[PDB]
Amino acid sequence: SGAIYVGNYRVVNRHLATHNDWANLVWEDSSRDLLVSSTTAQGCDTIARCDCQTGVYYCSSRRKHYPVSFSKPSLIFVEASEYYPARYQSHLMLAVGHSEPGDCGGILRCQHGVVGIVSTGGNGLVGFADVRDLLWLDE
Numbered sequence: 001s002g003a004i005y006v007g008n009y010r011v012v013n014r015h016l017a018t019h020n021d022w023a024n025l026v027w028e029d030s031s032r033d034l035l036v037s038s039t040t041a042q043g044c045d046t047i048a049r050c051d052c053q054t055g056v057y058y059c060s061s062r063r064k065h066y067p068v069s070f071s072k073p074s075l076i077f078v079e080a081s082e083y084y085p086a087r088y089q090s091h092l093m094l095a096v097g098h099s100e101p102g103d104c105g106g107i108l109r110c111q112h113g114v115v116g117i118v119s120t121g122g123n124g125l126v127g128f129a130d131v132r133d134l135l136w137l138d139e
């Protein structure tokens with residue numbers, strides 16, 4: 001679990017969105033595994049606007065943060081789960097590291113701010129859904 005809070009927005013993994021997230025929907029994209037809902041409270045996370053390929057992510061299945069190198073956002077084939085059939089997920093970044101389904105929502109950060117959230121894993125890889133291209137999150 002986990003979310004990003006910036007301004008009047010809440011960014012979560014689309015497959016973990018609640019009834020309240022869907023009742024206050026701002027934007028969602030199944031191909032990216034992202035959903036953004038509106039909030040009444042003001043959030044103060046900072047979104048990165050950069051092309052970093054190194055950062056640190058939080059792994060709840062180890063209660064640890066890990067430094068990683070990751071690929072630039074791209075279209076990657078993701079095996080089926082109970083939430084999606086096998087498909088290409090867009091705007092995904094991969095790194096070598098540990099990830100279990102419950103790790104989804106853990107933040108990946110660089111020196112400029114939040115880069116994305118855990119969205120995929122297995123076979124010793126971890127995948128992060130990018131948010132750096134969503135410029136409207138700041139306004």
Ligand SMILES: COc1ccccc1CN1C[C@@H](C(N)=O)CCC1=O
Pocket residue numbers: 015033078081082083084089099100101102103104119120121122
């Ligand atoms: C071993 O599978 C994983 C490991 C870490 C994280 C996630 C998974 C598998 N997964 C993929 C998600 C997606 N983005 O398509 C949907 C929910 C889910 O359980």
Ligand SMILES: [Zn+2]
Pocket residue numbers: 048049050051052110111112113
């Ligand atoms: Zn950066």
